[PDB]
């Protein structure tokens, strides 16, 4: 069961990182956008992935929101996959 989870966990980190980069790439050039520096963008992707998203940061551009949906999806899927495996194992 450490494979079905382990795999997802990889994809998750890859998405979080790529997402944080693409968001800053997509949001810049957007007047009033606040998702425009890497560090906080990484924090943004994680709170989104885990689907918590406090709203302190979020995207305002199309591609930013497209990056968003992918991060959310990857997130749900990953965490659900790790939970499925972790549950089964027990």
């Amino acid at each position: 069961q450490w494979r079905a989870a382990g795999a997802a966990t990889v994809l998750l980190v890859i998405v979080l990182l790529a997402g944080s980069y693409l968001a800053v790439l997509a949001e810049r050039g957007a007047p009033g956008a606040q998702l425009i520096t890497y560090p906080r963008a990484l924090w943004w992707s994680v709170e989104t992935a885990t689907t918590v998203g406090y709203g302190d940061l979020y995207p305002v551009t199309l591609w930013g929101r497209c990056v968003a949906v992918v991060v959310m999806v990857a997130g749900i899927t990953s965490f659900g996959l790790v939970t499925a495996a972790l549950a089964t194992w027990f």
Partner: antibody
Amino acid sequence: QVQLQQPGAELVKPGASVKLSCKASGYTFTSDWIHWVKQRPGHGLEWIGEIIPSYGRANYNEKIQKKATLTADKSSSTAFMQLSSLTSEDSAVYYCARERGDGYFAVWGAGTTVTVSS
Amino acid sequence: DILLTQSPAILSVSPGERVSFSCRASQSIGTDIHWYQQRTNGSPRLLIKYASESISGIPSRFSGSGSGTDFTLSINSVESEDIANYYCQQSNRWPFTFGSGTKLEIKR
């Protein structure tokens, strides 16, 4: 050692256009953004635009009139700002700076004094 | 876009004294404000980043304070080498912006 190298000067006749440069050195990442700041004698700093060489995208200041076009050259680590159809107004010192994507400009260029005269 | 108000434009202080330059944001920007020094004919020089975080190579004479919309750059015991133009710059919302500037001026 000095990180951003900019040509000390560049003369230009009204209506003409010059392509400034800025060659890098030291540490480089894919998260690096090169910015350009205009500064007329006496007055302060004015952000002009930015570019991410490790992708090529550039955004420009929408308040001011667009008179520039940023480009980069990964290999030579050189960023280019193309200023077209200049006028007395465009004459000033232009600095390029490196921003680690964290919001502040750690290091700046010596700036290129540009004069628009006949 | 965010407006950085730097006033007064000139500050006159006596040597060794403490001086404070203030920068006000048109809206809350947390602590995404950064300070630069620029001496006559020099290029800007990062002094303080993120409002308070220090920078290596910069006198411990320099310090920052504030959050939201009100920021202060300080100098303890000014001195000739400190005569310059100080600017504040924010990275809270795009596109980054600059303060009008504040010229320090020592009275000897």
